[PDB]
Amino acid sequence: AALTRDPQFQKLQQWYREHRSELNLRRLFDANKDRFNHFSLTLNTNHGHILVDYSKNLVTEDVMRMLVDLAKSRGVEAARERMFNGEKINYTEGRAVLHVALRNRSNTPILVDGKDVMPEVNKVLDKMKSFCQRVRSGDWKGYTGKTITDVINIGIGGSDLGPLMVTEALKPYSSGGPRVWYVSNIDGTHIAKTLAQLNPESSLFIIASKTFTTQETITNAETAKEWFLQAAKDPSAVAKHFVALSTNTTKVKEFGIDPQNMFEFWDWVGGRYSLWSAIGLSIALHVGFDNFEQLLSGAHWMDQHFRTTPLEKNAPVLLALLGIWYINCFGCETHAMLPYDQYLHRFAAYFQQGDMESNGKYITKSGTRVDHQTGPIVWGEPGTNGQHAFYQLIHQGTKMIPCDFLIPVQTQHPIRKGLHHKILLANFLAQTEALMRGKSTEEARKELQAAGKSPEDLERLLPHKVFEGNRPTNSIVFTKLTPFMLGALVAMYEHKIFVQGIIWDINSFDQWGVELGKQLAKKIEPELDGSAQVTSHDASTNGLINFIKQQREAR
Amino acid sequence: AALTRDPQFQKLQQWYREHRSELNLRRLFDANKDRFNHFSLTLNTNHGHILVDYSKNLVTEDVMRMLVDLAKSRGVEAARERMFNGEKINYTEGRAVLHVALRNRSNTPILVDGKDVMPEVNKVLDKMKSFCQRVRSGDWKGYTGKTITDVINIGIGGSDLGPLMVTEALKPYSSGGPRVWYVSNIDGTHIAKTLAQLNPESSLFIIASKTFTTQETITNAETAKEWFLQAAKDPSAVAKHFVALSTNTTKVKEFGIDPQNMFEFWDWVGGRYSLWSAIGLSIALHVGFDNFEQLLSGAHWMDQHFRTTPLEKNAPVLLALLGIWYINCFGCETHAMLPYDQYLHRFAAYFQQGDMESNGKYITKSGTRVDHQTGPIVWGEPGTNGQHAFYQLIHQGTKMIPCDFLIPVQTQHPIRKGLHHKILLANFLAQTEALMRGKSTEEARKELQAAGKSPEDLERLLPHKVFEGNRPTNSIVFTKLTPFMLGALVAMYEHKIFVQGIIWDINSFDQWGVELGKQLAKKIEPELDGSAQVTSHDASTNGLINFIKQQREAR
Ligand SMILES: O=C(O)[C@@H](O)[C@H](O)[C@H](O)COP(=O)(O)O
Ligand SMILES: O=C(O)[C@@H](O)[C@H](O)[C@H](O)COP(=O)(O)O
């Protein structure tokens, strides 16, 4: 693997072996008063500031330096330029990677196979703009002359999670917009529980599918259609309640949706990167089109930052580099994303797919197997809730778990003269502080004594109340969570993923494990039909199938 | 640490060192046709069967044997009996651990400090039964003579997640019940967005708090109260819309809720184990009291199974033991819980708190530090969604990730003559199959050729389409997800956690990291007030506070 062969990587690894023991946050902070100044970055977007404070990390000036040196040596700069220029850097599918073109508000020409993709990106935006206005204003009428009150996205994965995370996070901006629902799972529960609350006369279904062949989506889609036709009984009415977000025109047509109702996208738009395309129609419908444009601008701003900023102060790069430090040196398997914002309750889950699906790889550009770790397991829940649950382990377990703590300075709901937000912020600041400094035997002993504990009550209890601390975290604090800022934060991590991907020399933009999952279920499916016992697999798959069948009958 | 000193543990570890290389699922399956029979367990509860198939694990008869031997040597049996007898096994708080008494339908006497806790457990159930009937039937009227249509749980953590997970999962059983909302986070968004959709005339608030001092809950609670009094303007009306689930009577009274409106619980009920107590009132109100009783019976059944079944075929024990194998031998940091059921969309998250908060420890009963791993990082999302996102990493990453795949044989919504559920099941069966057998170079080469790929297209692509497989999983398939079965599945994992806890010699039932988080925010809080720069912390906490303040002003 390229990484391990890297001189800078080896230099980085030997230092780790030599100094890990000298990396103590308490000591690093008291020995350098400019530690926050030197290990923090500030982005003024003109639509809010973002503070990327990575000072509570197990790093010194020499590591960062080495980390940066490793970024150059691995060719992060040129690889980045390849993506922005539309070269086919998704070498296994032979595709370009241009989610950055979807939000290219500047409209500088971006070529794919010699042809500027921009005129078509904008043609689809206009189209989404025009449709959104009509639907939101009431001009667009359902089959009985009623306005749309409900918009239902049917799609799974990249055609689901993004639009879901964003509408959820931008909820406050949905005044005057129809309600949005996300049906993704093939589990009948998802479609049925949603349909039960809908009136066909005012519901609009959106079939979000790049290939338009994904089993789950097309099955949900057919069920939605049949439920709709049972009411409308007129196939011409479908053009009034069904639209498609796909790249496959023939498929859309064959399904029964009229080409005019197709909002198209391109093969260079990876699903886990598709919210900026037509796939984000649900968002535009919910919060309005201007807000959609604001979302893409924020990402556009972040793109410009990723693209022209020197590595030493490049937000996505530094975050990627700290992750490498913890992954390839400290050995941490996971990476937590803890947004202290109830509107971002799906943020971590969105990047669980974005990160893990992007960088959960073991094959390099040269086809050789990595002999190092790659993408981490990303998870998290919003603060403060997590403080009452899994933080126990982050504080007192046997795993190191790098954490990203995120939060808006301004809340959408400054109720009680800002009481709730102050408490939220205070909890936000103190966990990274505490995770950092912990609480020693003596500190715990002192307080126990003060509490009037007896020499023997104190002695048994004490060690259990001891915190070792030294647990690294990032604090990302932004002005306010508006459509613009949201777009920038998401695009920040997208690029974090990309830097780490290059450094590992893997393909961040294919997903053969997902591609395979989309073919795996074919044998089993028809074998579940009938009552015969199955015997054509391993004993486990056969044993499970036979239990399923035995249990089909029980009442 | 006790674990490492254990002869059976050492015997287990030496074998691992000697044979890990001989552990290949494909080979283990073709070399032993009774592999599913021997490495699977079946529980007939009389209200459904549960198949715990652990055959796709990296284990042989000799390991399990050793694993079981390790359970005996570590005294799992007697420690279990201690818990069921009500001894104070939460040695650091000096508390008993009797979540099993909350669902002790048998009513055999269970003593805490010599006194049977049962008469009081039942007194509170009756009380919840009586209240639920009144509220659900319409007999209980709001301050203007209207019936309750909305029940709002205010509580965080153990006083939140359980009731949330269960009502969500038992949604189909809520016919004739009021809607339920869960406000947990201090984030003003949570309370405000909920209150905006409520009419005070027909909303009932439940303040779920063991201590009744938790900052977030009491603040939400006060905000709820003020919003209610602004409408009702009569303090006597509070007795008609506010109830408490607490152990602290004085506090409840001091808050303004009338003692008759208190549903009490006890110190031996750990929050992450409290859904079976009064804390589950929301559930009983939503799905009805009989269903609540059904939930507790299922757990009661699982308790009996945990308690009287020989270790070799004890569900919780075996699951705990497989986890130890992967944690203390293979070194896996995480453990995934993948319910293929949209109703269980919070199941994994519930056990993220139950597991991690329980076993994220490093101090043993003797006060010495563990020199081995303990609780893992638990995460997951429902299937099939995950197959399109993070499975990419489980399939092709550089981490081993033990997975629990769960699913009902019978869905609550057999729409389309069972089409969706068959597809769901087929996807459920094939991922564990595929995770297991993977796809070799030759298999990928063969298919690529068949696809007419050119010698050079094939050659570059191939290695990327190669799956190494050998990724272990458990399949837990049950008859149908009813209140009863749900109760049994939850209680199964509760006991899994407990076995692993004993084996590690840690206290699964305290949570000083959470206890500490509940005190940490006091300095910061008043320092956020005002405009002065803060300088009384480390440079990071000061730098963040000062950015927060600078950004308070921006528009
Ligand atoms: O990220 C991916 O590639 C997958 O999650 C796909 O987005 C998902 O399978 C949806 O596929 P499609 O949009 O082609 O229906
Ligand atoms: O698990 C825990 O102990 C915590 O999550 C508590 O349940 C949480 O802090 C709620 O505390 P209380 O119920 O005392 O308000």
JSON list of N, CA, C and O in Angstrom, two decimals, chain B residues 173-213:
[
{"chain": "B", "resi": 173, "resn": "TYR", "atom": "N", "xyz": [-50.32, -1.09, 18.32]},
{"chain": "B", "resi": 173, "resn": "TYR", "atom": "CA", "xyz": [-51.21, -1.40, 19.44]},
{"chain": "B", "resi": 173, "resn": "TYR", "atom": "C", "xyz": [-51.79, -0.17, 20.10]},
{"chain": "B", "resi": 173, "resn": "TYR", "atom": "O", "xyz": [-52.39, -0.26, 21.17]},
{"chain": "B", "resi": 174, "resn": "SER", "atom": "N", "xyz": [-51.66, 0.98, 19.47]},
{"chain": "B", "resi": 174, "resn": "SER", "atom": "CA", "xyz": [-52.09, 2.22, 20.11]},
{"chain": "B", "resi": 174, "resn": "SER", "atom": "C", "xyz": [-53.49, 2.68, 19.73]},
{"chain": "B", "resi": 174, "resn": "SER", "atom": "O", "xyz": [-53.88, 3.79, 20.07]},
{"chain": "B", "resi": 175, "resn": "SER", "atom": "N", "xyz": [-54.25, 1.84, 19.06]},
{"chain": "B", "resi": 175, "resn": "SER", "atom": "CA", "xyz": [-55.59, 2.23, 18.64]},
{"chain": "B", "resi": 175, "resn": "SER", "atom": "C", "xyz": [-56.31, 2.66, 19.88]},
{"chain": "B", "resi": 175, "resn": "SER", "atom": "O", "xyz": [-56.19, 2.02, 20.92]},
{"chain": "B", "resi": 176, "resn": "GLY", "atom": "N", "xyz": [-57.04, 3.76, 19.80]},
{"chain": "B", "resi": 176, "resn": "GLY", "atom": "CA", "xyz": [-57.80, 4.24, 20.93]},
{"chain": "B", "resi": 176, "resn": "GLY", "atom": "C", "xyz": [-56.96, 4.89, 22.02]},
{"chain": "B", "resi": 176, "resn": "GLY", "atom": "O", "xyz": [-57.44, 5.08, 23.13]},
{"chain": "B", "resi": 177, "resn": "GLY", "atom": "N", "xyz": [-55.71, 5.22, 21.71]},
{"chain": "B", "resi": 177, "resn": "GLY", "atom": "CA", "xyz": [-54.87, 5.89, 22.68]},
{"chain": "B", "resi": 177, "resn": "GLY", "atom": "C", "xyz": [-54.47, 7.28, 22.22]},
{"chain": "B", "resi": 177, "resn": "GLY", "atom": "O", "xyz": [-54.46, 7.57, 21.02]},
{"chain": "B", "resi": 178, "resn": "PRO", "atom": "N", "xyz": [-54.16, 8.16, 23.17]},
{"chain": "B", "resi": 178, "resn": "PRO", "atom": "CA", "xyz": [-53.75, 9.52, 22.82]},
{"chain": "B", "resi": 178, "resn": "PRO", "atom": "C", "xyz": [-52.39, 9.47, 22.13]},
{"chain": "B", "resi": 178, "resn": "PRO", "atom": "O", "xyz": [-51.72, 8.43, 22.19]},
{"chain": "B", "resi": 179, "resn": "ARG", "atom": "N", "xyz": [-51.99, 10.55, 21.49]},
{"chain": "B", "resi": 179, "resn": "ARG", "atom": "CA", "xyz": [-50.69, 10.60, 20.83]},
{"chain": "B", "resi": 179, "resn": "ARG", "atom": "C", "xyz": [-49.66, 10.79, 21.91]},
{"chain": "B", "resi": 179, "resn": "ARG", "atom": "O", "xyz": [-49.97, 11.40, 22.91]},
{"chain": "B", "resi": 180, "resn": "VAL", "atom": "N", "xyz": [-48.43, 10.30, 21.71]},
{"chain": "B", "resi": 180, "resn": "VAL", "atom": "CA", "xyz": [-47.33, 10.49, 22.67]},
{"chain": "B", "resi": 180, "resn": "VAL", "atom": "C", "xyz": [-46.15, 11.27, 22.09]},
{"chain": "B", "resi": 180, "resn": "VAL", "atom": "O", "xyz": [-45.75, 11.02, 20.98]},
{"chain": "B", "resi": 181, "resn": "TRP", "atom": "N", "xyz": [-45.58, 12.17, 22.88]},
{"chain": "B", "resi": 181, "resn": "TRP", "atom": "CA", "xyz": [-44.47, 12.98, 22.45]},
{"chain": "B", "resi": 181, "resn": "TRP", "atom": "C", "xyz": [-43.37, 12.80, 23.46]},
{"chain": "B", "resi": 181, "resn": "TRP", "atom": "O", "xyz": [-43.64, 12.62, 24.64]},
{"chain": "B", "resi": 182, "resn": "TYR", "atom": "N", "xyz": [-42.12, 12.86, 23.01]},
{"chain": "B", "resi": 182, "resn": "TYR", "atom": "CA", "xyz": [-40.98, 12.77, 23.90]},
{"chain": "B", "resi": 182, "resn": "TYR", "atom": "C", "xyz": [-40.07, 13.99, 23.76]},
{"chain": "B", "resi": 182, "resn": "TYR", "atom": "O", "xyz": [-39.44, 14.21, 22.72]},
{"chain": "B", "resi": 183, "resn": "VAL", "atom": "N", "xyz": [-40.05, 14.78, 24.82]},
{"chain": "B", "resi": 183, "resn": "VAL", "atom": "CA", "xyz": [-39.25, 15.97, 24.93]},
{"chain": "B", "resi": 183, "resn": "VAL", "atom": "C", "xyz": [-38.16, 15.60, 25.89]},
{"chain": "B", "resi": 183, "resn": "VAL", "atom": "O", "xyz": [-38.42, 15.37, 27.06]},
{"chain": "B", "resi": 184, "resn": "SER", "atom": "N", "xyz": [-36.93, 15.55, 25.44]},
{"chain": "B", "resi": 184, "resn": "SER", "atom": "CA", "xyz": [-35.87, 15.16, 26.35]},
{"chain": "B", "resi": 184, "resn": "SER", "atom": "C", "xyz": [-34.75, 16.19, 26.45]},
{"chain": "B", "resi": 184, "resn": "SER", "atom": "O", "xyz": [-34.30, 16.56, 27.53]},
{"chain": "B", "resi": 185, "resn": "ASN", "atom": "N", "xyz": [-34.28, 16.62, 25.30]},
{"chain": "B", "resi": 185, "resn": "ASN", "atom": "CA", "xyz": [-33.15, 17.50, 25.22]},
{"chain": "B", "resi": 185, "resn": "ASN", "atom": "C", "xyz": [-33.46, 18.85, 25.85]},
{"chain": "B", "resi": 185, "resn": "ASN", "atom": "O", "xyz": [-34.60, 19.31, 25.78]},
{"chain": "B", "resi": 186, "resn": "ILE", "atom": "N", "xyz": [-32.46, 19.50, 26.44]},
{"chain": "B", "resi": 186, "resn": "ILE", "atom": "CA", "xyz": [-32.66, 20.85, 26.97]},
{"chain": "B", "resi": 186, "resn": "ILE", "atom": "C", "xyz": [-32.82, 21.87, 25.80]},
{"chain": "B", "resi": 186, "resn": "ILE", "atom": "O", "xyz": [-33.41, 22.94, 25.94]},
{"chain": "B", "resi": 187, "resn": "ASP", "atom": "N", "xyz": [-32.29, 21.49, 24.64]},
{"chain": "B", "resi": 187, "resn": "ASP", "atom": "CA", "xyz": [-32.39, 22.30, 23.43]},
{"chain": "B", "resi": 187, "resn": "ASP", "atom": "C", "xyz": [-33.82, 22.81, 23.32]},
{"chain": "B", "resi": 187, "resn": "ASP", "atom": "O", "xyz": [-34.76, 22.03, 23.17]},
{"chain": "B", "resi": 188, "resn": "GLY", "atom": "N", "xyz": [-33.97, 24.12, 23.40]},
{"chain": "B", "resi": 188, "resn": "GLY", "atom": "CA", "xyz": [-35.27, 24.76, 23.32]},
{"chain": "B", "resi": 188, "resn": "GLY", "atom": "C", "xyz": [-36.12, 24.27, 22.17]},
{"chain": "B", "resi": 188, "resn": "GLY", "atom": "O", "xyz": [-37.35, 24.30, 22.24]},
{"chain": "B", "resi": 189, "resn": "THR", "atom": "N", "xyz": [-35.47, 23.84, 21.09]},
{"chain": "B", "resi": 189, "resn": "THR", "atom": "CA", "xyz": [-36.18, 23.31, 19.92]},
{"chain": "B", "resi": 189, "resn": "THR", "atom": "C", "xyz": [-37.12, 22.21, 20.33]},
{"chain": "B", "resi": 189, "resn": "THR", "atom": "O", "xyz": [-38.26, 22.17, 19.91]},
{"chain": "B", "resi": 190, "resn": "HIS", "atom": "N", "xyz": [-36.64, 21.31, 21.17]},
{"chain": "B", "resi": 190, "resn": "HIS", "atom": "CA", "xyz": [-37.44, 20.16, 21.53]},
{"chain": "B", "resi": 190, "resn": "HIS", "atom": "C", "xyz": [-38.77, 20.54, 22.17]},
{"chain": "B", "resi": 190, "resn": "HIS", "atom": "O", "xyz": [-39.81, 20.10, 21.71]},
{"chain": "B", "resi": 191, "resn": "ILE", "atom": "N", "xyz": [-38.74, 21.36, 23.22]},
{"chain": "B", "resi": 191, "resn": "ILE", "atom": "CA", "xyz": [-39.98, 21.73, 23.90]},
{"chain": "B", "resi": 191, "resn": "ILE", "atom": "C", "xyz": [-40.83, 22.65, 22.98]},
{"chain": "B", "resi": 191, "resn": "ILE", "atom": "O", "xyz": [-42.02, 22.39, 22.73]},
{"chain": "B", "resi": 192, "resn": "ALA", "atom": "N", "xyz": [-40.21, 23.70, 22.44]},
{"chain": "B", "resi": 192, "resn": "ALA", "atom": "CA", "xyz": [-40.94, 24.65, 21.59]},
{"chain": "B", "resi": 192, "resn": "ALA", "atom": "C", "xyz": [-41.66, 24.02, 20.38]},
{"chain": "B", "resi": 192, "resn": "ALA", "atom": "O", "xyz": [-42.82, 24.34, 20.10]},
{"chain": "B", "resi": 193, "resn": "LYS", "atom": "N", "xyz": [-40.96, 23.15, 19.66]},
{"chain": "B", "resi": 193, "resn": "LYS", "atom": "CA", "xyz": [-41.59, 22.57, 18.47]},
{"chain": "B", "resi": 193, "resn": "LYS", "atom": "C", "xyz": [-42.74, 21.64, 18.88]},
{"chain": "B", "resi": 193, "resn": "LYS", "atom": "O", "xyz": [-43.71, 21.47, 18.14]},
{"chain": "B", "resi": 194, "resn": "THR", "atom": "N", "xyz": [-42.64, 21.07, 20.08]},
{"chain": "B", "resi": 194, "resn": "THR", "atom": "CA", "xyz": [-43.69, 20.19, 20.56]},
{"chain": "B", "resi": 194, "resn": "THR", "atom": "C", "xyz": [-44.90, 21.01, 21.05]},
{"chain": "B", "resi": 194, "resn": "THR", "atom": "O", "xyz": [-46.05, 20.76, 20.69]},
{"chain": "B", "resi": 195, "resn": "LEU", "atom": "N", "xyz": [-44.63, 21.99, 21.91]},
{"chain": "B", "resi": 195, "resn": "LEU", "atom": "CA", "xyz": [-45.69, 22.85, 22.43]},
{"chain": "B", "resi": 195, "resn": "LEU", "atom": "C", "xyz": [-46.48, 23.54, 21.32]},
{"chain": "B", "resi": 195, "resn": "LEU", "atom": "O", "xyz": [-47.68, 23.68, 21.43]},
{"chain": "B", "resi": 196, "resn": "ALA", "atom": "N", "xyz": [-45.81, 23.95, 20.25]},
{"chain": "B", "resi": 196, "resn": "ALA", "atom": "CA", "xyz": [-46.49, 24.63, 19.15]},
{"chain": "B", "resi": 196, "resn": "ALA", "atom": "C", "xyz": [-47.58, 23.79, 18.53]},
{"chain": "B", "resi": 196, "resn": "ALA", "atom": "O", "xyz": [-48.47, 24.32, 17.86]},
{"chain": "B", "resi": 197, "resn": "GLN", "atom": "N", "xyz": [-47.55, 22.48, 18.73]},
{"chain": "B", "resi": 197, "resn": "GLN", "atom": "CA", "xyz": [-48.57, 21.64, 18.14]},
{"chain": "B", "resi": 197, "resn": "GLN", "atom": "C", "xyz": [-49.58, 21.14, 19.16]},
{"chain": "B", "resi": 197, "resn": "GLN", "atom": "O", "xyz": [-50.33, 20.20, 18.88]},
{"chain": "B", "resi": 198, "resn": "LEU", "atom": "N", "xyz": [-49.59, 21.75, 20.35]},
{"chain": "B", "resi": 198, "resn": "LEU", "atom": "CA", "xyz": [-50.46, 21.27, 21.40]},
{"chain": "B", "resi": 198, "resn": "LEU", "atom": "C", "xyz": [-51.53, 22.27, 21.82]},
{"chain": "B", "resi": 198, "resn": "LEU", "atom": "O", "xyz": [-51.36, 23.48, 21.71]},
{"chain": "B", "resi": 199, "resn": "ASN", "atom": "N", "xyz": [-52.66, 21.75, 22.28]},
{"chain": "B", "resi": 199, "resn": "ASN", "atom": "CA", "xyz": [-53.70, 22.54, 22.90]},
{"chain": "B", "resi": 199, "resn": "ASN", "atom": "C", "xyz": [-53.63, 22.17, 24.39]},
{"chain": "B", "resi": 199, "resn": "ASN", "atom": "O", "xyz": [-53.73, 20.99, 24.74]},
{"chain": "B", "resi": 200, "resn": "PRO", "atom": "N", "xyz": [-53.45, 23.16, 25.25]},
{"chain": "B", "resi": 200, "resn": "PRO", "atom": "CA", "xyz": [-53.30, 22.91, 26.70]},
{"chain": "B", "resi": 200, "resn": "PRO", "atom": "C", "xyz": [-54.53, 22.23, 27.27]},
{"chain": "B", "resi": 200, "resn": "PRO", "atom": "O", "xyz": [-54.45, 21.45, 28.22]},
{"chain": "B", "resi": 201, "resn": "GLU", "atom": "N", "xyz": [-55.67, 22.50, 26.65]},
{"chain": "B", "resi": 201, "resn": "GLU", "atom": "CA", "xyz": [-56.92, 21.91, 27.09]},
{"chain": "B", "resi": 201, "resn": "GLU", "atom": "C", "xyz": [-57.00, 20.39, 27.04]},
{"chain": "B", "resi": 201, "resn": "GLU", "atom": "O", "xyz": [-57.81, 19.79, 27.73]},
{"chain": "B", "resi": 202, "resn": "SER", "atom": "N", "xyz": [-56.15, 19.76, 26.24]},
{"chain": "B", "resi": 202, "resn": "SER", "atom": "CA", "xyz": [-56.22, 18.32, 26.06]},
{"chain": "B", "resi": 202, "resn": "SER", "atom": "C", "xyz": [-54.84, 17.66, 26.06]},
{"chain": "B", "resi": 202, "resn": "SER", "atom": "O", "xyz": [-54.68, 16.55, 25.56]},
{"chain": "B", "resi": 203, "resn": "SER", "atom": "N", "xyz": [-53.84, 18.35, 26.59]},
{"chain": "B", "resi": 203, "resn": "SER", "atom": "CA", "xyz": [-52.50, 17.77, 26.66]},
{"chain": "B", "resi": 203, "resn": "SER", "atom": "C", "xyz": [-52.22, 17.37, 28.10]},
{"chain": "B", "resi": 203, "resn": "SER", "atom": "O", "xyz": [-52.62, 18.08, 29.03]},
{"chain": "B", "resi": 204, "resn": "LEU", "atom": "N", "xyz": [-51.55, 16.24, 28.27]},
{"chain": "B", "resi": 204, "resn": "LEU", "atom": "CA", "xyz": [-51.18, 15.80, 29.60]},
{"chain": "B", "resi": 204, "resn": "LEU", "atom": "C", "xyz": [-49.66, 15.65, 29.65]},
{"chain": "B", "resi": 204, "resn": "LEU", "atom": "O", "xyz": [-49.08, 14.93, 28.85]},
{"chain": "B", "resi": 205, "resn": "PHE", "atom": "N", "xyz": [-49.02, 16.34, 30.59]},
{"chain": "B", "resi": 205, "resn": "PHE", "atom": "CA", "xyz": [-47.58, 16.23, 30.74]},
{"chain": "B", "resi": 205, "resn": "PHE", "atom": "C", "xyz": [-47.18, 15.28, 31.85]},
{"chain": "B", "resi": 205, "resn": "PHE", "atom": "O", "xyz": [-47.77, 15.30, 32.93]},
{"chain": "B", "resi": 206, "resn": "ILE", "atom": "N", "xyz": [-46.15, 14.49, 31.59]},
{"chain": "B", "resi": 206, "resn": "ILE", "atom": "CA", "xyz": [-45.64, 13.50, 32.51]},
{"chain": "B", "resi": 206, "resn": "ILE", "atom": "C", "xyz": [-44.20, 13.88, 32.78]},
{"chain": "B", "resi": 206, "resn": "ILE", "atom": "O", "xyz": [-43.39, 13.99, 31.85]},
{"chain": "B", "resi": 207, "resn": "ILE", "atom": "N", "xyz": [-43.85, 14.11, 34.05]},
{"chain": "B", "resi": 207, "resn": "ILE", "atom": "CA", "xyz": [-42.49, 14.50, 34.32]},
{"chain": "B", "resi": 207, "resn": "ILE", "atom": "C", "xyz": [-41.77, 13.25, 34.82]},
{"chain": "B", "resi": 207, "resn": "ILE", "atom": "O", "xyz": [-41.91, 12.84, 35.99]},
{"chain": "B", "resi": 208, "resn": "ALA", "atom": "N", "xyz": [-41.02, 12.63, 33.93]},
{"chain": "B", "resi": 208, "resn": "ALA", "atom": "CA", "xyz": [-40.34, 11.39, 34.27]},
{"chain": "B", "resi": 208, "resn": "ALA", "atom": "C", "xyz": [-38.93, 11.66, 34.77]},
{"chain": "B", "resi": 208, "resn": "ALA", "atom": "O", "xyz": [-38.03, 11.94, 33.98]},
{"chain": "B", "resi": 209, "resn": "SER", "atom": "N", "xyz": [-38.75, 11.58, 36.08]},
{"chain": "B", "resi": 209, "resn": "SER", "atom": "CA", "xyz": [-37.44, 11.84, 36.67]},
{"chain": "B", "resi": 209, "resn": "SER", "atom": "C", "xyz": [-37.24, 11.13, 38.00]},
{"chain": "B", "resi": 209, "resn": "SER", "atom": "O", "xyz": [-37.97, 11.35, 38.96]},
{"chain": "B", "resi": 210, "resn": "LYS", "atom": "N", "xyz": [-36.23, 10.27, 38.05]},
{"chain": "B", "resi": 210, "resn": "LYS", "atom": "CA", "xyz": [-35.95, 9.53, 39.24]},
{"chain": "B", "resi": 210, "resn": "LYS", "atom": "C", "xyz": [-35.61, 10.46, 40.42]},
{"chain": "B", "resi": 210, "resn": "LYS", "atom": "O", "xyz": [-36.16, 10.33, 41.49]},
{"chain": "B", "resi": 211, "resn": "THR", "atom": "N", "xyz": [-34.68, 11.37, 40.20]},
{"chain": "B", "resi": 211, "resn": "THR", "atom": "CA", "xyz": [-34.25, 12.27, 41.25]},
{"chain": "B", "resi": 211, "resn": "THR", "atom": "C", "xyz": [-35.14, 13.50, 41.35]},
{"chain": "B", "resi": 211, "resn": "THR", "atom": "O", "xyz": [-35.24, 14.09, 42.41]},
{"chain": "B", "resi": 212, "resn": "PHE", "atom": "N", "xyz": [-35.77, 13.85, 40.23]},
{"chain": "B", "resi": 212, "resn": "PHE", "atom": "CA", "xyz": [-36.52, 15.09, 40.07]},
{"chain": "B", "resi": 212, "resn": "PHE", "atom": "C", "xyz": [-35.61, 16.33, 40.25]},
{"chain": "B", "resi": 212, "resn": "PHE", "atom": "O", "xyz": [-36.06, 17.39, 40.72]},
{"chain": "B", "resi": 213, "resn": "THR", "atom": "N", "xyz": [-34.33, 16.20, 39.87]},
{"chain": "B", "resi": 213, "resn": "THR", "atom": "CA", "xyz": [-33.39, 17.32, 39.94]},
{"chain": "B", "resi": 213, "resn": "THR", "atom": "C", "xyz": [-32.61, 17.50, 38.65]},
{"chain": "B", "resi": 213, "resn": "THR", "atom": "O", "xyz": [-31.81, 18.40, 38.54]}
]
